[PDB]
Q: What sequence folds into this?
């Protein structure tokens, strides 16, 4: 909307006020020929039924464009999807792709400030985040359930790191990795930020497994292994750019060995996908008969 | 109600009722013989606190004016009074239970517990030291503290036996609960060899309370710490109310919620029903002296009243706890969820103002939502709130440990064992008796039998190496008996016929050398048989028994439901 340069108008569906201002600004938005954006219309299951019927017989001008937004939610009526160009969005696979998504939210402006060890810590946080999220695609091997470790958890974890780094080195160009209270760091991040949502006693066992592996003083030692079997260890660096150049040199494909799981974890995954597919083809072939 | 309040502005007696709606614990203001000046504040349980600076409601002050003043003397008086209690306790011979109990009365339930935790914090800090004290030493300092309390506990462990007010009774019960937390924490610390001192996280993990007099403002004098989060006591009068048993799930929950408040995020405890979710958010607010308002969602929910309430939640900096949040009509779920999002984004940003439907936003406020878990690990919170809340899983409350402390405060001395037996018991009855829809073997239920056992124990009388042993054994079985007494009084009466031999059999497994006693209403039994012949009623033993369960229960609850198939003898 910015990039292109055209009157833009957003709106979050869910409120009482949300329904009306909308079936107006948008209606008008049409003849004028501007753009509109509704987001999370799925919250209005008993509403789009109307938005549909309307939009259908709502002839507009060439330049118009009504951009809606949603989450693969069964409330969306067919007609609504069928009358628009649907575009699907999925978190691509891989630890490398995971790291890049995380970094969009770690500005050099925040990461590059003293101590120099700050950046190395941010990277360890990001790598941690990638591991526990990639293991999500291996349930029930990776985790017992689907824990929604989101992006806010990372931000919160950074706020926490930042607190301890500012306590033990505020104003210095270097911090001592052994003077830092790692048990305190691991616990806040484990039991409060990322692990509050865990209701099992073994999935908590597993999260701390990774926490204790990456957030200890020895992790600051040069050539710290991340994935030994493949020779991959933490890069030496003190700036976001140093860490990005390392990320960008990683293979697009990650294997379960990266996540501390056996490689055959991938076999179960590739089979379940083979079953989902065969199963799907069989459906679109049954009706075609019946 | 605001109108009614305004008009009757000077006829206070008329407003009192509405106080339970503007103050957590303040239920009624105590006036002077002329009814022209407020001398203090009363709690629902009957406790009283006379203000230090009397307030006049005649001198001039209009409605809001004088209420704004009570709100201040409430905080003012308690803060000042806390200092006086610190000074009192500061000089008291812990062993002399006399001058000690003499101190528990000079102050509000609320303060006695704080004065207790302020000390304990400070004492533990010193024991651990500045991180330069050979283990052995610190370890000695802890035994000391760890033992000292265990003493204070015994005394109190005997007091609750002696006849005393429901008011004073709940105050010791509360103190018996906090003191068990104190020693239990220290005990942990004692299993800890390599301790860094006043700073070893094995200690910073817990909630500690520090009082720094050499601070201007009385309010800002108490500061609560937990992990790295810091709070000012709100000094909202709570009355006696309730205290939970600081079970390890509780402290783990305090850590997640305090960290959330500290991160300007909301609290979202989740799990099945009956795990201590809403109750824990309530004990935390009470711990930081906040005004906590719980909103019941599984009911007709007023959206219009919510808007108005969000405004005062924001303006007073009070706590809103939505109970069973997701059990709300999808439309209202989105309504409230959209308002919470605008307030919570406001908190995160730190703005002093909120733009709801500008207003001032009190930094101390907090939103909390409880609910059952989502599908396969997923959260049930609404998308828009997901990244705005810190969830906490509360799946298995520490029943054994709750039961245990719960009994100790009731007087029982063998609470460790009794709790280890009454908890698997409930678990068994739950799954090895008919599935009648009315059996309730949840915590709340488990606590009813414990609290009754208490009353019952207040109406009963207890009876070389080899000696102590017999003697313990006797006293031991004595309390076991008291517990069975409550088992029969509040459990088997609700049970249906076929489930009585099952329970009585089970009870035998769990309490081998002890059996159910017959009811001794010798008087009533006669009178009942006196009327039974008149009414032609065949007086059967299993029948008369039921009447006595009715008369028993009726002496407890003011609301009873006689139940069973038609022509089962209820009416007669
Ligand atoms: N730590 C605790 N100490 C004492 N009692 C508790 C504790 N946790 C739960 N309970 C008891 O168990 C019951 C739990 O119910 P509650 O927390 O109100 O519902 P929910 O867990 O569904 O929100 C409460 O009535 C409370 O008395
Ligand atoms: N103790 C008794 N001995 C003999 N007969 C009884 C006795 N109690 C009740 N009955 C008879 O059994 C019937 C029980 O019905 P009742 O208990 O009064 O209704 P409900 O069980 O629906 O409350 C009555 O009609 C009464 O005549
Ligand atoms: Mg009847």
A:
């Amino acid at each position: 909307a910015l990039q292109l340069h055209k009157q833009y108008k957003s709106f979050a569906i869910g409120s009482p006020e949300g329904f009306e201002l909308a079936e107006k600004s948008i209606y008008a938005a049409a003849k004028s020929g501007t753009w509109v954006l509704l987001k999370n219309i799925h919250l209005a299951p008993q509403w789009l039924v109307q938005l549909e019927k309307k939009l259908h017989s709502l002839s507009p001008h060439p330049s118009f464009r009504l951009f809606m937004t949603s989450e693969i939610h069964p409330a969306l009526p067919a007609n609504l999807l069928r009358m628009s160009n649907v575009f699907s969005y999925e978190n691509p696979p891989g630890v490398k792709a995971n790291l890049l998504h995380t970094f969009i939210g770690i500005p050099a402006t925040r990461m590059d400030k003293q101590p120099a060890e700050r950046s190395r810590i941010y990277f360890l946080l990001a790598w941690f985040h990638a591991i526990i999220q990639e293991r999500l695609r291996y349930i029930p091997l990776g985790w017992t359930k689907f824990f929604e470790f989101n992006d806010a958890d990372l931000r919160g974890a950074l706020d926490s790191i930042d607190y301890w780094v500012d306590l033990y080195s505020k104003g210095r160009s270097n911090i001592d990795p052994d003077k830092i209270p790692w048990i305190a760091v691991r616990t806040i991040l484990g039991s409060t930020i990322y692990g509050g949502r865990i209701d099992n006693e073994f999935d908590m066992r597993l999260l701390y497994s990774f926490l204790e592996q990456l957030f200890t003083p020895s992790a600051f030692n040069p050539d710290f292994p991340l994935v030994p079997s493949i020779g991959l260890s933490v890069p030496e660096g003190t700036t976001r750019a140093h860490f990005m150049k390392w990320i960008e040199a990683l293979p697009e494909i990650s294997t379960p060995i990266w996540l501390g799981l056996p490689e055959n974890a991938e076999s179960l995954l590739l089979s379940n996908k083979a079953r989902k597919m065969i199963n799907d083809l069989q459906k679109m072939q049954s009706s075609e008969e019946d | 109600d605001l109108l009614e309040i305004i008009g009757n502005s000077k006829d206070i007696i008329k407003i009192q009722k509405h106080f339970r709606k503007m103050f957590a614990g303040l239920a009624n203001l105590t006036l002077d013989d002329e009814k022209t000046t407020i001398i203090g504040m009363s709690s629902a349980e009957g406790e009283t606190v006379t203000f230090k600076k009397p307030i006049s409601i005649a001198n001039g002050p209009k409605i809001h004016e004088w209420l704004t003043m009570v709100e201040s003397e409430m905080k003012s008086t308690l803060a000042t009074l806390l200092s006086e209690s610190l000074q009192h306790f500061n000089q008291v011979d812990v062993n002399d239970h006399s001058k000690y109990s003499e101190w528990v009365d000079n102050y509000p339930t609320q303060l006695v517990l704080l004065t207790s935790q302020i000390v304990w914090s400070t004492q533990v800090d010193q024991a651990l030291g500045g991180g330069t004290l050979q283990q052995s030493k610190i370890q000695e300092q802890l035994q000391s503290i760890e033992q000292t309390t265990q003493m204070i506990l015994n005394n109190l462990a005997d007091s609750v036996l002696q006849d005393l007010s429901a008011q004073k009774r709940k105050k010791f019960e509360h103190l018996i609960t906090e003191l068990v937390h104190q020693r239990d924490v220290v005990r942990q610390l004692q299993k800890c060899k390599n301790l860094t001192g006043n700073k070893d996280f094995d200690w910073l993990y817990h909630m500690r309370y520090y009082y720094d007099a050499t601070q201007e403002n009385v309010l800002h004098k108490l500061v609560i710490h937990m992990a790295n989060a810091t709070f000012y006591y709100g000094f909202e009068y709570l009355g006696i109310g309730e205290r939970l048993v600081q079970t390890p799930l509780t402290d783990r929950c305090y850590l997640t919620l305090t960290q959330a408040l500290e991160s300007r995020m909301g609290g979202n405890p989740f799990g099945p029903a009956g795990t201590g979710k809403t109750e824990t958010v309530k004990a935390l607010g009470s711990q930081l002296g906040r005004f906590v308002l719980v909103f019941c969602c599984d009911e007709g929910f007023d959206l219009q009243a919510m808007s108005r309430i969000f405004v005062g939640l924001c303006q007073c900096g009070a706590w809103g706890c939505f109970d069973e949040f997701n059990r709300l009509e999808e439309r209202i779920l989105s309504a409230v969820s959209q308002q919470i999002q605008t307030i919570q984004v406001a908190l995160k940003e730190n703005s002093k103002e909120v733009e709801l439907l500008n207003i001032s936003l009190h930094q101390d406020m907090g939103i909390f939502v409880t609910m059952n878990p989502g599908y396969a690990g997923r959260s049930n919170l609404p998308d828009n709130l997901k990244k705005l809340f810190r969830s906490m899983a509360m799946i298995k409350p520490d029943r054994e440990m709750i039961a245990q402390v719960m009994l100790y405060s009731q007087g029982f001395k063998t609470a460790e064992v009794l709790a280890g037996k009454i908890v698997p018991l409930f678990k068994l009855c739950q799954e090895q008796l008919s599935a009648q829809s009315h059996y309730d073997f949840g915590l709340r239920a488990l606590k009813s039998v414990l609290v009754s056992a208490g009353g019952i124990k207040r109406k009963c009388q207890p009876p070389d190496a080899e000696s102590k042993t017999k003697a313990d054994q006797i006293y031991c079985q004595y309390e076991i008996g008291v517990l069975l007494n409550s088992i029969n009084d509040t459990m088997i009466p609700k049970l249906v016929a076929d489930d009585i031999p099952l329970i009585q059999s089970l009870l035998l497994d769990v309490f081998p050398g002890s059996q159910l006693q017959p009811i001794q209403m010798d008087q009533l039994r006669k009178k009942i048989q006196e009327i039974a012949k008149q009414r032609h009623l065949v007086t059967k033993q299993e029948w008369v028994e039921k009447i006595l369960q009715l008369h028993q229960i009726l002496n407890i609850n003011h609301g009873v439901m006689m139940v069973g198939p038609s022509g089962g003898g209820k009416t007669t």
Observations:
- Chain A touches chain B at residues 12, 14-16, 18, 40, 43-45, 71, 143-148, 150-152, 156, 159, 163, 181, 183-184, 187-188, 191-193, 196-199 (CB under 8 Å).
- The radius of gyration of chain A is 24 Å.
- Residues 97 and 173 of chain A are 31 Å apart (CA to CA).
